[PDB]
Amino acid sequence: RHEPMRIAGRLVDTDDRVEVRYPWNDTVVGTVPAGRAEHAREAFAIAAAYQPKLTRYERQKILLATAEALAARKEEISDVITLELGISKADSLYEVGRAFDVFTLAGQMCIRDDGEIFSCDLTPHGKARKIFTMREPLTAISAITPFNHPLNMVAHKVAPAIATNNCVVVKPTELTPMTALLLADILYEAGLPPEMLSVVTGWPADIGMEMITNPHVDLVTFTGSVPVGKLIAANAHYKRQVLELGGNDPLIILNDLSDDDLARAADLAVAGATKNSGQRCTAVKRILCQESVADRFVPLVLERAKRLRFGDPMDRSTDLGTVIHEKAAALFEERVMRAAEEGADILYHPGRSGALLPPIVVDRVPHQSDLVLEETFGPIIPIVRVPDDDDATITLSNSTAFGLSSGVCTNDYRRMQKYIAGLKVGTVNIWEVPGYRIEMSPFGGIKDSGNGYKEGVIEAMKSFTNVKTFSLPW
Template sequence: MSNTIISATANSEEVAVANGTHVLNLSCYVAGKPIASDNVLQVRSPYDNRIVGTVALAGAKETNEAIEAALKGGKKLNRYERYSVLDKTRHLLMQRKEEMAQLISAESGLAIREARYEMGRANDVLMFAAIECLKDDGQIFSCDISPNGKARKIFTFREPLNVAVAITPFNHPLNQVVHKIAPAIASGTPVILKPSEKTPLTAIRLTEILYEAGLPHYMLSVLLGPTSEVAEQLVKDERIDLVSFTGSVAVGKHIAKTAGYKKVILELGGNDPLIILEDADMNLAVTLAAEGAFRNSGQRCTAVKRILVHENIKAAFTKCLVEKAKEYTCGDPADSETKVGTVIDEPAAIYLEDVTKKAVAAGAKVLLGGKREGALLEPTVIADVPRDAQMVMCESFGPLAPILGFTDIDDAIALSNSTSYGLSAGVVTNNMQHAIRFVKELKVGTVNINEVPGYRIENSPFGGIKDSGLGIKEGVIEAMKCFSFIKTFSMPW
């Protein structure tokens, strides 16, 4: 069941309900001020449909107030003060690690072990962003290096933007948010956050922690509400300097068309292959395929969505993967033994079930899994998948492991490049010449050799091309460049 808006008034932070569980009553914030509203979003667990929390929603009035508060500004934090806020936020977050992990799991349906892992990633983002506050990437250019030069020097430094907008998806309720907010704060840029309506509770809790850590309130607002009054208004407003969006291709392209004259960062979908060559280490290949396809319920833009295997080893690999996939137990996300929780909601699971049926109708074979119960979909291994099947031409955001064969390297490269996406790829091989060729010829933003497509650290550049994005990189360091601009000045020297 999708999260729904109801007419009610949230008048306390946490209330008990009939079954003894607790419901968080939260609100949006305009520059630190909680919003009082009769329009309330119910956030339900994808696993058992219980109400996890509610959020008092914003409207056009609050959206405008958030922009005006950011533009008005307030106390400007120096580098050390920005470092201190981010570092304190990191420590406060880690003190509440289990509480936050349980909230992530409850509102998203992700297995608790995945939520705990996400807490560690968020810790890294905050740590790297804090460290970058203490660095200066300014440059100096001597002007007497040409016959037309003068005895001057040109200096560069960074200045923050006036205000940025960050729009985040559901699949990483904490880490996707931190990846936008932390670099903005590190750059000194006020940001207005619009998290996913499907997983807003974690984002609001993070906002409250940032305020507690000493972030000036004008630096951060968090808004949810009707699309026309919040998201659309934020994207179109001429006072906004930048829109950073992570989500679907359709919405990303709509933002690109409507944003107007401002910076736009689009991190969109992926259809990432894991390419397994004939010389690959079989145990490594199987492990990477299972981890890449099933972790986070397969809900990563960089998840393994296509497993391309050389025909000479395809049968042996498929047999091993089926056995490995049996280890990925599916069930109650709150159970520490569960490896795969739900996808984000039942409609998403129904879509995945449907594309699997279509592939089977076209000749594919389900070797393991495939059963659905509500938003739970078992990790599914599918063999003999046609190259034009919907599940491999479009992004299938869930725990599916479709296997396709290829005959040689030329065929593997052509097959990998055959979709409209270009985010990441993984290649499993012990042949350096082959590895180099894939690095050069795959039309993606990242190629990882003997690793899953999505491997990175939180400050390394990340982003895709084609329908996966505009080629603008994220990751803490690159994001900080986007959330600022370079000013130059020169002096006699």
Template sequence: MSTTTLETPAAVNGAATFTPVHMPAYIAGRAVETGRTLEVRYPYDGSLTGTAALIGHEHLDEAIKAALEGGKKPLSRHERSTILRKAAALLAERREEFARLITRETGLCMKESRYETGRSSDVLEFAAMEALRDDGQVFSCDISPMGKPRKIFTTRYPVNVIAAITPFNHPLNQVAHKLAPAIAAGAPTILKPSERTPLTALKFAALLYEAGLPGWMLSMFLGTLDEVINPMIEDERTEVVTFTGSVEIGKAIAKRAGYKKLCLELGGNSPLIVLEDADLDLAAKLACEGSFRNSGQRCTAVKRILVQESILEAFTEKFVELAKTYKSGDPEAEDTVVGTVITEDSAKLLERRVHDAVKMGAKVLLGGNRKGALLEPTVIANVPRDAEMVHEESFGPLGPIVTIKDLDDAINYYNSGRFGLSSAIVTNNLQAAMRASKELKTGTTNVNEVPGYRLEHTPFGGVRDSGLGIKEGVVEAMKFFTHVKTFSLPW
């Protein structure tokens, strides 16, 4: 392993001070305090980031009742679009404030936190546009010998209540991805953010109210599993459960939710396939960006780099040299590119997986050092395919290199696993690119780009253990949050 020295935490070296924040729960727009709170701490040095109020079951019931009652007088398309555009403008004004809080909750570097606020603005803007778009259809009935002189029309109406649960790794954008399409569709939502990063989410809820969102359209809160979370999932009044997070929890939700619409966006183990005809400078850049950005904590991050054996040495040299420029350290320092992972325990798990892979014959070429929740960007060569590091989802800044014989080998290897979220291939061979796009059993395949590339309104979702195949993205989410109604008239 390298002997690079990790920087001393900010609390010791005198970085900028931060005043801890407190956020209430919001029940139908009303700020609620119960005297019970949850602490949130900065992963980099353990200092207090803030506290958030915890609610009880009675508050959950109040939130659902308010959503049902308010839904009797739905917002117009123009009202929904205006609220979303106003929210986008407010977020743009407060970008630095939100970015600082994201960094203090997650340990992500400021570069990533600012990037996330920009993506969240896109979600709001795209949802504002889609709120104005009517996707109704018209079918003529006289096209069949059995037809009649009639036309069939379709329209959409929102579900009664959406129950949403979001993860820690994108504490603003994941929340925006649930709420913006719901608002655009006119569907009331109750949302439980991650207990690791609730402050950003609750601050975003307050911004939405300020933008004009009626209270009944949104409740956001934290609570215990038995008192709040399970009842929220099971309640027959919630028509949709949308969850982003781990495979295990997603499958547990599926069993508990019962007869309702489910959108489960779960884990991934995305490969970057590098073929012998690839532009190696591009391949090295995509490997670094995919493996180390957001501290490797994206469900679509590059988790395995599958390199054809004929170019293995040349690619590895370029990858290691470029990876050296991805500086890790104080998340609030402007030159930091890789901050911490979410907890010290998460970093220890990653560190252990590196050590286990080394015992199996792998070799650490760069990084591998850990201090608290800070783990250096790490490049590992000769990783066996059955190593836990690549067999399971490793949520952190690891760049494991696995040798492949050819494209057939890469496709068979990936398809034999249980995940199916995203993938990427680096090649200048159109036929190879098309084969990968067709044959990889995954929700997304990108050519000469990282696995996670997309726009905020395009379809996104996985198959197999990465999800039920239901797509997110503004357009698909709006469809999922509505019911289709058909009616016919004489014509």
């Protein structure tokens, strides 16, 4: 399958191609244009020149029709996702489900006007006057999207833009660009004025910088690696920046739990470490288990890990597909091996095959090992034994460069509140994985996980607008 760029509804092709490979067998499944700065430049010019005038009703219609099209075409879309990313169909179908929610909730948010009113006779020198508040769209939005959610991460950037009468230009990663192109087609079909969306593709070295630098761009919204995020922050000079970078999120198991609770916690740990092949910013990447319950906890985790079916992503009975590519998979295995040399205990490792990593279980992981100190973006299930002391646990949890989300399992309210207050993260989930949220709750991290702005449909809609005030004599 060869797919051209979508520039404001026009199919735009290029001589050189970028090959898209299925990580399961490293075969080419598609091709997209090796687009250049000029292509992004054109897309941005079209975006800047066009002023969306959709009514709130029209926007809701487009967004809800898009959701309906996602539901109707889910098997087809999830096929595209799996073929370029290598996650299981189970995982890619789930992703279509998320994108369906995003477009639905964005559509429903169209009916909301968060305008405020201020009375002005408030101080000795007030006036008989009212100030009113209103939102207007930007000139152009630049959206740069990651490989791990080839559909949903585009949705999270594009739906709020549409809902808010913005024009957006999307550049997906060269590893998984086809899903974005398909979504564009679906949007055009759902009635979106074509000028409001372009999807361009190419090598980072050709077209990447134009996405950061184009003079029409008022806001850059990016999800991806810390390095690339810091690079954007350094070059997107006088522009608003919404940067979501990695996480290194803990699932913390406290020593008040019964054996039944440990089993429930083990269920969360395995699912959390392993969904989407562990490729989530908010994946469980560190299981911090307090020492006194670790001996009962670890076997429960091992047992659940062994139940997971890993293999052919297109097989509907597969739980766990591949990671993004063999190089990533080999790197993750390497960190496991090194952790083991540093004192860790590999409990389950049926062996790696290419980009296919099994849900490896490792106990007694040293917290300073690369495996858990760096972000490891794969289905590793690593247990770090931590002291039966909350202060020390919290300190250890806070000791990485990251601060995105977290999960804490405990039934003791006092301890719950202590962790909620004490963890240095954007989100603390009690009795859920760090990845748990709804599409419209505020989402975003601190430290190296993000520059401190919130995402999610509602906050993104705010980010994508300028507030204008006006006052009238009253």
